[PDB]
Symmetry: C2
Subunit: 131 residues, 2 copies
């Protein structure tokens, strides 16, 4: 083919890595996070990117596994925002996550998946509530 | 008394979850294959972070939730092999067992979160 079926972070491991990198790049210019919190998020994002690079190198990714891993990434960001206090309100942190996701979409596909973003923002609230 | 404060127990908890799930109803062999690949991948990431001296409780909690949420997402995305209710109950039982085999203390709010994730991921799909 041409790659017409490998055009999103959910079907293309390289695009998933770029999405995750781009999320972390954008988030660093948004309100609500301390340096130390950004550092933790970048460590976890880099861990997720390497995990995907390694699965890709092995030939072991699939659409379903990539969807699972993109949700894993977004959940880990939601979790850490809910666990780490200081730096801004829950509400500020949440909309910064949403903005960072949104801009990562624009940087990677050129198209924001709003229902995906809305899930992620529901995760922050859920994890904080539980916290 | 939580499994993911120490990298070693964090890994054991993921492997125990996976080993218990493999004996539970509701999942086909290929679904478990997919879950097993993702679990092995997460354990490896924790090992790599521990070797470079970069773990912390907050980070391990976040990685643990990446794992549990990946399992819930897989379960909700891959149809067949049993009802959503069976998939959710097997996931909850494998999670409960994993706490018992590591710290000895089941974290119920956490189990309840993961159950909610299966349901929220199935609705979104």
């Amino acid at each position: 083919g041409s790659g017409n079926s490998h055009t999103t972070p959910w079907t293309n491991p390289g695009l998933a890595e770029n999405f995750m990198n781009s999320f972390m790049q954008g988030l660093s210019s948004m309100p609500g996070f301390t340096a130390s919190q950004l550092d933790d998020m970048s460590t976890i994002a880099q861990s997720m990117v390497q995990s995907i690079q390694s699965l890709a190198a092995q030939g072991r990714t699939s659409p379903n596994k990539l969807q699972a891993l993109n949700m894993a990434f977004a959940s880990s960001m939601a979790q850490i925002a809910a666990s780490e206090e200081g730096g801004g309100s829950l509400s500020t942190k949440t909309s910064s996550i949403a903005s960072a996701m949104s801009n990562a979409f624009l940087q990677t596909t050129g198209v924001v998946n709003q229902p995906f973003i809305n899930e992620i923002t529901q995760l922050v609230s859920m994890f904080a509530q539980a916290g």
